Amino acid sequence: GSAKKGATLFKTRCLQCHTVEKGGPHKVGPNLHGIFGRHSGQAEGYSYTDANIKKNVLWDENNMSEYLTNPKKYIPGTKMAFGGLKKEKDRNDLITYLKKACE
């Protein structure tokens, strides 16, 4: 749908934690550059949990929506603190905004 409204969603709901464009910030969440679902985590040496590596998951936009809907129910024991995206439309706005910056 709309990738330009996903820019606004990512700014308020994500940007304070992640960053897509550089590869060095590693604030709270790991860098989101090039997420087609490498597998679980990507290593600058960013300290991960024991939950993510378990059960490797390709981050395809359909399952990504599940993870953004309920981060806790999708991966129990995740360090990521996010309520979720309960709406369906705002997901399809944010998930598209990502992969064009993942070039």
Partner 1 sequence: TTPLVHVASVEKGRSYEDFQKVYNAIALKLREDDEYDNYIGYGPVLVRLAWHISGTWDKHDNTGGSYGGTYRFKKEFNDPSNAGLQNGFKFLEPIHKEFPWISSGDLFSLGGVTAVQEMQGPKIPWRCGRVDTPEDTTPDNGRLPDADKDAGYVRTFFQRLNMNDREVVALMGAHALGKTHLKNSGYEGPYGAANNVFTNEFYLNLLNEDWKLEKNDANNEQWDSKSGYMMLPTDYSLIQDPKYLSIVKEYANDQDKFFKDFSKAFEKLLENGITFPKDAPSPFIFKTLEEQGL
Told to check if 9 binds partner 1 by CB under 8 A, we report yes
Q: 56-95: which residues touch ligand HEC (CB under 6 A)?
A: 67-68, 78-82, 94
Q: How far is it, in rounded angstroms, from Cα 69 to Cα 91?
A: 8
Residue 10 exposure: Cα atoms within 13 Å on the Cβ side: 20
Site string for partner 1, 60-89 (x = CB under 8 A): ----------x-x--------xxx--xx--
Give Cβ neighbours of residue 102 (< 8 Å, ≥ 6 apart). Answer: 20, 32, 33, 34, 35, 36
Binding residues for partner 1, how many (CB under 8 A)? 14
Annotated binding residues for heme c, written as ranges, equal: 14, 17-18, 80
